[PDB]
Amino acid sequence: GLTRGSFPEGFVFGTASAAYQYEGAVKEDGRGQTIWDTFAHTFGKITDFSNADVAVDQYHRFEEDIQLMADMGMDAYRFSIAWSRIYPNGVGQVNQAGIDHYNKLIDALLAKGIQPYVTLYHWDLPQALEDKYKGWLDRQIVDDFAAYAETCFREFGDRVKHWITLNQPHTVAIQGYDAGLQAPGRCSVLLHLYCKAGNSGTEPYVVAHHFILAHAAAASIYRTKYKATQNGQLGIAFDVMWFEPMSNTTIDIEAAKRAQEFQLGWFADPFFFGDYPATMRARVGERLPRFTADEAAVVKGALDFVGINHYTTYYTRHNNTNIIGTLLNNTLADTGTVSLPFKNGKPIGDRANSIWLYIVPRGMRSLMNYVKERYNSPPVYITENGMDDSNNPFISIKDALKDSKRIKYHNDYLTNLAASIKEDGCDVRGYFAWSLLDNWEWAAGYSSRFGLYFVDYKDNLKRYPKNSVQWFKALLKT
Numbered sequence: 016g017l018t019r020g021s022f023p024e025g026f027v028f029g030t031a032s033a034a035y036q037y038e039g040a041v042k043e044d045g046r047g048q049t050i051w052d053t054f055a056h057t058f059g060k061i062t063d064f065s066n067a068d069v070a071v072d073q074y075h076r077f078e079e080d081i082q083l084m085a086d087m088g089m090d091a092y093r094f095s096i097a098w099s100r101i102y103p104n105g106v107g108q109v110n111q112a113g114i115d116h117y118n119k120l121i122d123a124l125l126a127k128g129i130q131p132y133v134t135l136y137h138w139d140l141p142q143a144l145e146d147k148y149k150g151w152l153d154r155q156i157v158d159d160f161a162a163y164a165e166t167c168f169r170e171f172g173d174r175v176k177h178w179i180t181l182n183q184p185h186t187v188a189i190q191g192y193d194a195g196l197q198a199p200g201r202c203s204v205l206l207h208l209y210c211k212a213g214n215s216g217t218e219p220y221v222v223a224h225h226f227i228l229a230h231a232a233a234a235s236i237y238r239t240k241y242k243a244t245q246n247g248q249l250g251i252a253f254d255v256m257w258f259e260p261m262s263n264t265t266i267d268i269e270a271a272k273r274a275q276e277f278q279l280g281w282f283a284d285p286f287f288f289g290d291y292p293a294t295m296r297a298r299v300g301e302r303l304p305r306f307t308a309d310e311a312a313v314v315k316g317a318l319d320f321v322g323i324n325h326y327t328t329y330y331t332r333h334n335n336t337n338i339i340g341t342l343l344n345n346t347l348a349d350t351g352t353v354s355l356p357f358k359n360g361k362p363i364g365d366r367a368n369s370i371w372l373y374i375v376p377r378g379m380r381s382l383m384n385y386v387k388e389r390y391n392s393p394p395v396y397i398t399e400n401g402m403d404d405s406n407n408p409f410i411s412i413k414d415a416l417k418d419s420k421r422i423k424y425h426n427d428y429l430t431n432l433a434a435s436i437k438e439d440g441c442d443v444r445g446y447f448a449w450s451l452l453d454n455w456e457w458a459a460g461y462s463s464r465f466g467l468y469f470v471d472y473k474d475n476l477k478r479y480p481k482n483s484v485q486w487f488k489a490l491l492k493t
């Protein structure tokens with residue numbers, strides 16, 4: 016079946032990680048508090064009462080983990096820099112120990128022939144900026160993020176040639192500010208009583224606007240000051256569910272397209288065309304910010320590549336609502352759609368551990384074609400794809416390693432990806448499995464095991480290879 020030969024020469028295979036989910040050492044070497052330290056230490060926010068204070072301790076164990084990557088023949092590793100290790104208070108005094116740590120990590124990767132693909136922002140905003148101005152809700156975040164990015168370009172860009180400014184701005188806008196299920200946990204209290212403050216109808220759009228501007232500000236710095244010498248590239252990782260119409264009818268086909276425009280187009284249309292999708296302007300109206308002429312000119316073209324984080328495909332139908340009015344405005348109502356993994360009483364596919372993660376390999380190919388067609392064939396990396404096992408205390412570790420479902424998932428999604436490149440002409444350059452290790456899965460805590468390696472939380476975080484490790488090693492062989 017699949018081999019490296021199934022993909023273009025030079026195609027990059029990696030695994031992905033994120034600082035807060037992996038590093039631990041949350042108070043070590045001057046690290047500043049982040050919104051996720053606060054959130055994980057707040058009652059009710061994490062389903063299994065857990066936090067990432069130690070996580071899988073990659074802060075201390077990265078050399079071990081790098082050898083695990085090399086064991087499989089991985090080309091690359093996607094990891095994030097914790098902003099609060101570099102600027103513990105978001106701005107001001109740089110923390111030299113943070114710079115030193117990530118230099119050691121980058122050098123240890125390169126020593127093993129593994130290329131670093133670095134995410135600047137993977138959700139862990141320094142708490143000091145949240146306290147000062149409510150973080151992404153204030154335009155000041157644009158300058159502060161750009162200054163932090165510049166520091167990273169200056170310190171690491173001689174070696175780091177692939178930068179992901181932001182991870183899943185759509186997820187952050189919706190989960191952090193509409194549903195209030197992720198940090199900082201804001202929403203309309205009339206929609207969800209557990210939130211302390213917010214507005215599900217307005218705040219997600221403000222946050223998204225600031226993400227877009229923050230990327231463009233960092234990209235402007237990179238292009239003007241670093242890119243010529245460093246010869247690297249900058250992109251963003253978008254979370255993108257594929258949507259299929261719930262019926263093959265004009266109304267539902269149009270609904271599926273609209274759902275996609277509200278998910279990916281919300282961010283990608285500015286970066287390619289210099290404004291939000293027309294459907295969003297029509298439906299969100301005055302709650303959707305407007306770019307100035309000068310902003311649009313810095314935003315349009317600001318990506319070198321499109322990172323796609325994709326897991327699943329849902330069915331989408333048209334939806335007519337009338338809801339009061341301002342008080343219950345929210346982003347799902349704004350889309351005029353409903354999406355779910357069920358049609359005519361049947362699931363769209365098998366499901367992984369996560370209650371949202373339906374196994375639909377064809378969606379990978381459909382999405383690659385959508386991106387090529389809508390955005391004129393930009394370079395794409397799959398910056399995240401994979402699935403999770405449950406954390407099951409009632410089975411042996413040996414049985415937990417038999418991840419035949421994960422093997423079939425990666426096999427099927429990669430087969431579809433390979434076809435989108437070979438038969439469809441999609442410009443895909445690389446693929447990053449989520450995730451190298453089992454890790455702290457945000458509000459799901461330790462209940463979800465996404466790793467190629469099993470982590471024994473009961474035995475000093477010992478790493479054991481699941482069956483998928485051999486599968487990838489055989490795939491990647493030369």
Ligand SMILES: *[C@H]1O[C@H](CO)[C@@H](O)[C@H](O)[C@H]1O
Pocket residue numbers: 033036182183324399449456457465
């Ligand atoms: C991609 O999705 C995984 C699983 O939910 C998550 O752990 C990452 O942080 C996200 O970027």
